[PDB]
From a paper:
Allomorphy is a post-translational fine control mechanism where the catalytic rate is governed by a conformational switch that shifts the enzyme population between forms with different activities. β-Phosphoglucomutase (βPGM) uses allomorphy in the catalysis of isomerisation of β-glucose 1-phosphate to glucose 6-phosphate via β-glucose 1,6-bisphosphate. The active site of βPGM is located in a cleft formed between the cap domain (T16–V87) and the core domain (M1–D15, S88–K221), and these domains reorient in response to the binding of a phosphodianion group in the distal region of the active site30. Substrate-free βPGM exists as two distinct conformers with different activities due to cis-trans isomerisation of the K145-P146 peptide bond on the multi-second timescale. Allomorphic control of βPGM involves the isomerisation of the K145-P146 peptide bond situated within an allomorphic control loop, which leads to either fully active cis-P βPGM or partially active trans-P βPGM.
The ability of βPGMD10N to produce stable bis-phosphosugar complexes was leveraged to compare the structural consequences of partial allomorphic activation by F16BP and full allomorphic activation by βG16BP. F16BP is bound in a single orientation as the β-anomer, with the axial 2-hydroxyl group and equatorial 3-hydroxyl group hydrogen bonded by the carbonyl group of V47 located in the substrate specificity loop (V36–L53). The K145-P146 peptide bond within the allomorphic control loop (E140–I150) is completely in the cis conformation and the alkylammonium sidechain of K145 coordinates the 6-phosphate group of F16BP, which is aligned and in van der Waals contact with the carboxylate nucleophile of D8. The 1-phosphate group is coordinated by R49 in the distal region of the active site. The arrangement of groups in the proximal site in the vicinity of N10 and the catalytic magnesium ion (Mgcat) is broadly similar to that observed in the cis-P βPGMD10N:βG16BP complex (PDB 5OK129). Intriguingly, in the cis-P βPGMD10N:F16BP complex, the sidechain of D170 is rotated by ~15° in a planar manner so that the alternate carboxylate oxygen atom coordinates Mgcat. The resulting proximity between the other carboxylate oxygen atom of D170 and the carboxylate sidechain of D8 is close enough to predict protonation of one of these oxygen atoms. Notably, the interdomain hinge closure angle observed in the cis-P βPGMD10N:F16BP complex corresponds better with the domain arrangement of a NAC I conformation (cis-P βPGMWT:BeF3:G6P complex, PDB 2WF927, non-H atom RMSD = 0.9 Å), rather than that of the more closed NAC III conformation (cis-P βPGMD10N:βG16BP complex, PDB 5OK129, non-H atom RMSD = 1.4 Å). The transition from a NAC I conformation to a NAC III conformation appears to be obstructed by steric clashes between the carbonyl group of V47 and both the axial 2-hydroxyl group and equatorial 3-hydroxyl group of F16BP.
Residue numbers in the entry: 1 to 221
Write the structure that this text describes.
């Protein structure tokens, strides 16, 4: 049997992409950059805080000091944090709470493999802290998804190898990170947003323990 499930946050447990988007747009508008719209934000989502800012700057051919850059990222983050203060248990994605209950009931480890440093605060706001055996710290890994580092760390933080793990992701960079960790990906959403040679479910109501076990057995050799 698998021993752990490694969860993405945004796209799987909940999704705060709207707040990330609004904070980025607000920052761009403050510094006088045109074109940070919903279509552009598709380039931003599965990208890090620093890489997101850089893309926005590049869009304007705007150069900043290293100090300026840190200040702009902080400003966006401070604004984003304000927006997520009202996140509640009602923002947990369909089926997720029951899955976390069933995993814990079966003594399968639960770990967060988010690229977001606001991950722990969001789990608290959704009242999910207690279910998480560990939270990989994206500030203590050498690279963001699609590097496998965060999934490797997530697995290790609960005492398992990725090979003994299922990863749950919603993005291309996320799916690739899981693959390269050696864990088994199951994607949620549309194929073109996920990747190939994986099991995909259309929405998180399909992530049940029964399904995860069946997929596990299908993928063992
Ligand atoms: O890995 P997840 O849970 O999908 O979160 C993805 C988000 O994490 C980030 O890379 C960084 O998040 P923070 O800015 O909250 O630290 C965002 O740029 C991206 O939208
Ligand atoms: Mg995601």
């Amino acid at each position: 049997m698998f021993k752990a499930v490694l969860f993405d946050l945004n796209g799987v447990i909940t999704d705060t992409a709207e707040y990330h988007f609004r904070a980025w747009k607000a920052l761009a508008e403050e510094i006088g950059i045109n074109g940070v719209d919903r279509q552009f934000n598709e380039q931003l989502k599965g990208v890090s805080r620093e890489d997101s800012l850089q893309k926005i700057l590049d869009l304007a051919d705007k150069k900043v000091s290293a100090e300026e850059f840190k200040e702009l990222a902080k400003r966006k983050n401070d604004n984003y944090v304000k927006m997520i203060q009202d996140v509640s248990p009602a923002d947990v994605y369909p089926g997720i709470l029951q899955l976390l209950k069933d995993l814990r009931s079966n003594k399968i480890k639960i770990a967060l493999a988010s690229a977001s440093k606001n991950g722990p605060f969001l789990l608290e706001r959704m009242n999910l802290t207690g279910y998480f055996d560990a939270i990989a710290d994206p500030a203590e890994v050498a690279a963001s998804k699609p590097a496998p580092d965060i999934f490797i760390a997530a697995a290790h933080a609960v005492g398992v190898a990725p090979s003994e793990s299922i990863g749950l992701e919603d993005s291309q960079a996320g799916i690739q990170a899981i693959k390269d960790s050696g864990a088994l990906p199951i994607g949620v959403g549309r194929p073109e947003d996920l990747g190939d040679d994986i099991v995909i479910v259309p929405d998180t109501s399909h992530y049940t323990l029964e399904f995860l076990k069946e997929v596990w057995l299908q993928k063992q050799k």
